[PDB]
């Protein structure tokens, strides 16, 4: 169970990398992406007229399945 003994040095290493990102002034992921399944379920959630969120997700999954198909 105890983590491998390189843990402390890996943490310090990972922290030094995170630190240079902090100093870059480029902190965010700004990537253009496209996945058909993510696009479809987001489009269904967006175009829904259902107000309550759990019910909106219920109908969106059904419309996803019918359109995928």
């Amino acid at each position: 169970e105890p983590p491998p003994d390189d843990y402390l040095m890996k943490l310090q290493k990972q922290l030094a990398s995170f630190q240079s990102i902090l100093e870059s002034g480029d902190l965010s992921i700004n990537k253009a992406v496209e996945n058909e399944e993510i696009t479809l379920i987001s489009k269904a959630l967006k175009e829904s007229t259902i107000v309550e969120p759990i019910e909106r997700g219920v109908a969106a999954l059904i419309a996803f399945h019918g359109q995928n198909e």
Binding site: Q14, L22, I29, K31, N35, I38, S42, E52, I54
Partner: protein
């Protein structure tokens, strides 16, 4: 509609975790559940079991009722990123998902997980969506390094680096979502359906 955000802080989870077994807490805990109709104030998920109480100002020494809201466990763990999957506390993966808000993702995942545990015909579609979500962890690690889609790692990096300001936290977590773990929540997912 309360505001969901990803928070990594050194000691909030410890105060929140200790409060949870305090006896004075269980008194007013039921008042909040009753006030909110056992409904998560972030994603809308309703359940009699396993609901949590989170503090709007993030200050777990301020437990006046007007600072407390009901929260399901997918939403509650967003406020303790550094503790997710630590010691059996919840579980999840950081993903790049600009297409959904965290609240939208959480209410959808309740729907997806129910559709997967109790197949009525939509398990496959629900698995396809959840797997496309989980795949988006790789974009987080391409930016921040190997392993950093683990929220416990990412949150420890922020804390140990001294990340203090809201402005920096907002940038680091921009379009990143904590995707709840279907595997780690199997006890809750099944018990929610029977109950």
């Amino acid at each position: 509609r309360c505001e969901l955000k990803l928070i990594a802080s050194p000691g909030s989870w410890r105060l929140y975790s200790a409060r949870k077994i305090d006896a004075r807490f269980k008194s007013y805990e039921q008042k909040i559940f009753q006030r909110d109709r056992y409904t998560c104030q972030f994603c809308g998920f309703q359940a009699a079991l396993y609901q949590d109480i989170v503090n709007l100002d993030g200050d777990y020494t301020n437990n006046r009722l007007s600072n407390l809201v009901t929260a399901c466990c997918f939403c509650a763990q967003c406020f303790f990123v550094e503790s997710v999957g630590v010691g059996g506390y919840g579980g999840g993966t950081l993903i790049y998902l600009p297409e959904l808000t965290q609240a939208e993702l959480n209410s959808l995942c309740h729907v997806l997980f129910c559709a997967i545990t109790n197949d009525t015909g939509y398990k496959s579609s629900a698995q396809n969506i959840y797997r496309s979500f989980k795949f988006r962890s790789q974009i987080v690690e391409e930016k921040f390094g190997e392993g950093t889609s683990d929220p416990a790692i990412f949150g420890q990096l922020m804390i140990d680096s001294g990340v203090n300001s809201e402005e920096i936290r907002e940038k680091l977590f921009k379009n990143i979502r904590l995707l709840p773990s279907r595997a780690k929540f199997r006890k809750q997912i099944e018990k929610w359906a029977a109950a």
